[PDB]
Amino acid sequence: MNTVPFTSAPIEVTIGIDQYSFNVKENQPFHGIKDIPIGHVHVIHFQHADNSSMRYGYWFDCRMGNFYIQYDPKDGLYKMMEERDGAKFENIVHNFKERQMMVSYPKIDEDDTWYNLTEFVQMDKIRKIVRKDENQFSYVDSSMTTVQENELSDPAHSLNYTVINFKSREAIRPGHEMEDFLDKSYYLNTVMLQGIFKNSSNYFGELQFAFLNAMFFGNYGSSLQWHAMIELICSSATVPKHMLDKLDEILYYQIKTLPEQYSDILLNERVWNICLYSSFQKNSLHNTEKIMENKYPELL
């Protein structure tokens, strides 16, 4: 069980860790989050009481080092940092626990939600989508734009998701125009799975990471990426049986977890109605279909 200490909490902010969150008052003696489950990625995120604009946050993995949070009064935000002095860091952590100024990561033992949402997400891949190589953790906020979005400005602050585009040469083999556009199996299996992602786990992992960024930061290009990657699978006539079953599990937990009030912008009517009802794989998402109907029948 690992810990992310906080130097202080100078400004009123709502702090999230994974799917949990706490209100912290200006100069409340908050000094960190303890009992974080080792073995998964995690995201700690922020929304200032005074600017409900720009939700922001840090993806990290405690196996990769000792991380802590510190407010920066110049840049105006809670920054994640790494403490390289292992002894100085256990000291800070032990004393804050002793004084009991830390919240416990509040996991119900029955609950596999976070595992299920992060099953295929790996820090090493996150750091390739969010390129900032001097840090071991990754910043994302509400307003970061994607490489694809940029093509249609600042590259240092971009989300380098894998570009998917159904009307590109990449997606369409010459001479198979009609075939490949109606049945995206060759784009999915040869171009994307075998060629770029190498395997289904890294594919699932980026999908999951994109969903999570759309949910936690309202990052709109992430939402576009999550939908694109679903649609490519659902629009392919030929998909390994192991991916289809896993996909139904993945989507299920994502739909389960989404705030109810947000279904309007985070869920793309067209993609979902096409995947669940028109696509080759309509009948392969039984759990995802059942939850979607009982929870957002309006969108459908």
Partner: protein, 237 residues
């Protein structure tokens, strides 16, 4: 963006552009089988690909053989249209390739777009206009060459005959659409108006009668009258 009444004069500028209409590509007769079930028989169709500025018409004849053993033919018809258009563009010298292709039906967009991926600078556009180009098979010479074809064939016409010698593209295009609109609403009457006078003939290299300027005005009047009347009959106005 979409082509409409507002940006209508853009057809006649010096940017090369083509209309594509696919309404006569997949043509069938519907009939009863011996067992009383319904069945279709295809007949020869065509892609109607037209430069509105110059009148050049790239009539690509779709022989029934192209449907042999194929499913979802109405969907396939859109892709074959887009395949044949793309090949026409590839066959043309660079300086003849269009800058825009305007499809008369929005369902051609994705098929044409996918086939033209090699031509990213050719803009594929829909239109809000209701162009009568489906009536192209009411022009006797066009219908005859289509129905007689025994293999795939491209036939070239100038759809304005020699009009541009005397009128502008804008006026030539309005004449063509008025003629075809009339043929579309009431072919029998339209054709009657055009051939009533045996002394006005169609040149062998032409599609329409060699009317004088003054006779064109009477004709156009006769075609406008035809169109209005059919409108009252349709809607009881």
């Amino acid at each position: 963006g979409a082509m409409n009444s507002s940006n209508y004069a853009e057809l006649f500028n010096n940017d090369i552009k083509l209309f594509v209409d696919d309404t006569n590509v997949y043509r069938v007769t519907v009939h009863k089988t011996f067992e009383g079930n319904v069945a279709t028989k295809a007949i020869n169709g065509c892609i109607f690909t037209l430069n509105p500025k110059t009148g050049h018409l790239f009539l690509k004849i779709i022989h029934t053989s192209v449907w042999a053993g194929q499913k979802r033919l109405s969907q396939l018809a859109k892709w074959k249209t887009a395949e044949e258009v793309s090949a026409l563009v590839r066959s043309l010298p660079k300086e003849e390739q269009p800058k825009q292709i305007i499809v008369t039906r929005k369902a051609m967009l994705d098929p044409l777009e996918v086939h033209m991926l090699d031509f990213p600078n050719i803009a594929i556009r829909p239109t809000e206009l209701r162009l009568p180009f489906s009536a192209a098979m009411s022009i006797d010479k066009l219908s005859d060459v289509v129905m007689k074809a025994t293999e795939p064939q491209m036939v070239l016409f100038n759809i304005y005959d020699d009009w541009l010698d005397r009128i502008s593209s804008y006026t030539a295009f309005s004449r063509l659409t008025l003629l075809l609109r009339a043929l579309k609403t009431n072919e029998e009457s339209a054709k009657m108006i055009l051939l009533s006078d045996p002394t006005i003939t169609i040149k062998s290299y032409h599609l329409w009668p060699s009317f004088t300027d003054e006779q064109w005005i009477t004709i156009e009047s006769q075609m406008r009258d035809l169109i209005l009347t059919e409108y009252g009959r349709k809607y009881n106005v």
